[PDB]
Amino acid sequence: MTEPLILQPAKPADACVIWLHGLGADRYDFMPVAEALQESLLTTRFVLPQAPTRPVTINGGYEMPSWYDIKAMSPARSISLEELEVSAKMVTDLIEAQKRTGIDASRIFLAGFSQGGAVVFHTAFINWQGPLGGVIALSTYAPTFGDELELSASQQRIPALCLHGQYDDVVQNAMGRSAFEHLKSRGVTVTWQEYPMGHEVLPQEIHDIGAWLAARLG
Amino acid sequence: MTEPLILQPAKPADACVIWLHGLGADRYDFMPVAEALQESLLTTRFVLPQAPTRPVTINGGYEMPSWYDIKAMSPARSISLEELEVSAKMVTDLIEAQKRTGIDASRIFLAGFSQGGAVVFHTAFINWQGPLGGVIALSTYAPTFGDELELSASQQRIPALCLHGQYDDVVQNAMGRSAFEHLKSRGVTVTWQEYPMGHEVLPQEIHDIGAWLAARLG
Structure with a gap:
């Protein structure tokens, strides 16, 4: 287990963003975005966990930072659900450890790009029962959402910001859109x-995320 | 061993465009495009072969039309040089049958989308040592172009048109650009x-192709 990166904000932290990378990246991959974002979120800590290095099946069993195994690209986008649940769990433990440092759970946000964003959806809307600040989900989808998904009262109260490129050929706009609808249909305050x-990731995307968080912190 | 789709022109054919589809698709994929172009190229025949049905490793051994095996994606890509060469070998066969039909090698063009383009690159500039109209590469690259690439006098004389999407996440824009650059350094008349x-594929791009060809046969 590689330790998460933790990036000190300018003033003391009274908010946190836990931010997960995609397949093959590491804990550094979203440092430049975190740091950019910390130019205006003055009291938000950014925690950048690294996925375990494990065989990735579409990559020939090549071992790399992975939140869960992907086994085929198509037709079936087939993945390891057990590994996914072990990650959702590790993220849950991260939320708890941030609370212990004195950040309030209404001011912890979970963010995730691609593979990472799949884990953030599951952690927030399947596992978590407390207050939470927000889910930000970048170029992602929720392979563990479906028509049977029910939210507790507490999970409905978690707002969600959802972002995507029109021209994504690895996770279709449509999949990103399906995860959003899933929560929209169900009462969650959710932006697309x-x-x-x-x-x-684009600069304008980062700016928008910065605006949404600050609106949630204010 | 499924057979080609041959669309015959409005006038006696005196040219030929052999178009190979991408991974997982079929010989009907580009039929609409070929028909669009024929409304412009009035003497130009389109023969659309189909990739044989094989296991694709990165898709979970799911069998689908496939020009060669993709065994991994990242960080070192891996393919089947063997099946690539029997696909290459079978294009060259579609060519010397068009020749026998009564078309001249100088107005036979090869065209490829994605996985098809990598097969057309290998046949034009590695196998074929004769006259050829030209290569049209769409959203593609050249797994078999490296530093040791060396063209012959006749291969250098084949013109190419390389087309690509800015936000291609399947075949990186850079992978398509690199094919263009190996061809340019080696004396080839290429357009990007x-x-x-x-x-x-876009309407404009298909418009750009038809224009290119009308110049090649002009």
């Missing part, structure tokens, strides 16, 4: 943003 | 056109 891009 | 799009 699309940008003209692929499976990546 | 980029589009605001993912892994797909």
